[PDB]
From Swiss-Prot, chains A, B:
Enzyme Commission number(s) from the entry: 2.1.1.228
Pfam family, one: tRNA_m1G_MT
Positions contributing to S-adenosyl-L-methionine binding: 110, 130-135
Annotated localization: Cytoplasm
The name this protein goes by in its record: tRNA (guanine-N(1)-)-methyltransferase
The protein's enzyme class: transferase
Gene Ontology annotations of biological process type: tRNA N1-guanine methylation
Quaternary structure note: Homodimer.
PANTHER family: TRNA (GUANINE-N(1)-)-METHYLTRANSFERASE
Catalytically driven reaction(s): guanosine(37) in tRNA + S-adenosyl-L-methionine = N(1)-methylguanosine(37) in tRNA + S-adenosyl-L-homocysteine + H(+)
InterPro entries in the cross-refs: Alpha/beta_knot_MTases, tRNA_m1G_MeTrfase_C_sf, tRNA_m1G_MeTrfase_TrmD, tRNA_m1G_MTases_N, tRNA_MeTrfase_TRMD/TRM10
General function of this protein: Specifically methylates guanosine-37 in various tRNAs.
Family that this chain belongs to: Belongs to the RNA methyltransferase TrmD family.
Organism field: Staphylococcus aureus (strain MRSA252)
């Protein structure tokens, strides 16, 4: 697979493109992750931005530059063109899975108060948001999504996790549960299972309602609450 | 406000810390956004990582280094310590709002198969996830969240948005709706309102069910569907 980022700030990507566990695939000829400076496709004035027909307070991303960029990037039909949007589908795993299968992805990163509809109908294949929160630009989101998608290339049990501890045993008066140093694995497993139940009960009672509790599980919770008195 | 990132890859941040619309506040003495190299707090071996008591296949982030880092960073009580986690609360706007009010935030960025529970009980104040998708590290998430929080410092109408267009009027046979060039603002507003209704009807019927439709709105939808025949 290969990935292109058409952005006005290709520099934002230097730190991440290299120094992250991203090179696993880059050096392994699995993928080409390269940045594209969008100002190369701009027009009298080298702006990729222009006024809205009908009026409005914001500016709108022009169609021409974007179509041109897609041209030389040889985006075929069956390449994925992603627009970073607030009203886009919030990104998810089923979506990360779907994308890791395409052989080519292009991200329109710049945040504009508007996008020419012709770009949305003819070029863009997926519109994606990160969550109900509002961001200043689409480059971070594009990088975050790349991570999730790439690391899913080739190369819960319904409860919260059991608490984990490492050395030292005692630190500033904070001691690791004795059971963990006992070497008795049936007791360590049982204790972790109890902690998972209890933590879920205290912090994600919704998860408990959708967990098929065994009689022993109910007895653990029952005595736990009696211990709180 | 001030923000610290304790990470093993401070380089990932160079591109973003500067070149994004982040400098608005940095140069304006509103905030200090600086990176901290976590390997400065490491132990015989300069690892921040160590084996799990009780056994397990992954490694666990040691408590000592993290507590030390929080010490010299002068994290007071009433500073926010954030751990990037999969089971953390997915990040949201209400959370972005809450955080933009704190005067100091520290992000533990490294992804480990485990975190010593003492860090979670004594240091960490918020545990946050990005969504059900799994990421390779916590630095991108920390940067994304910073963006949403910072830009919310000081410095929907229930339907999908109306489609936007800019020059040129005709491009590759793709023409901007005539109404937008007509200069008749009551017609432009009505047309946009119709498009919002129609698009929402076709793509987010759930939003239509929670919209207080007027008689005129129902007539727009009604004739639209008759136009589809």
């Amino acid at each position: 697979m290969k990935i292109d980022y058409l952005t006005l700030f290709p520099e934002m990507f230097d730190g991440v493109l290299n120094h992250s566990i991203m090179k696993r695939a880059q050096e392994n000829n699995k993928l080409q992750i390269n940045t594209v400076n969008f100002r190369d496709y701009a027009n009298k004035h080298n702006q990729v931005d222009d006024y809205p027909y009908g009026g409005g307070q914001g500016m709108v991303l022009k169609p021409e530059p974007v179509f041109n960029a897609m041209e030389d990037l040889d985006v075929t039909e069956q390449a994925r063109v992603i627009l970073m949007c607030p009203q886009g589908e919030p990104f998810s795993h089923q979506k990360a899975v779907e994308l890791s299968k395409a052989d080519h992805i292009v991200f329109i990163c710049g945040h504009y108060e508007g996008y020419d509809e012709r770009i949305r109908t003819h070029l863009v294949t997926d519109e994606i948001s990160m969550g109900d929160y509002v961001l200043t630009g689409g480059e971070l989101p594009a990088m975050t999504m790349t991570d999730a998608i790439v690391r899913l290339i080739p190369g819960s049990d319904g409860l919260l996790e059991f608490p984990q501890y490492t050395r030292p045993r005692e630190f500033k008066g904070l001691t690791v549960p004795d059971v963990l140093l006992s070497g008795n694995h049936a007791n360590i497993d049982a204790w972790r299972h109890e902690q998972k139940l209890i933590r879920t009960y205290n912090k994600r009672p919704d998860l408990i309602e959708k967990y098929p509790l065994t009689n022993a599980d109910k007895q653990i919770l029952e005595r736990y609450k009696i211990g709180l008195k």
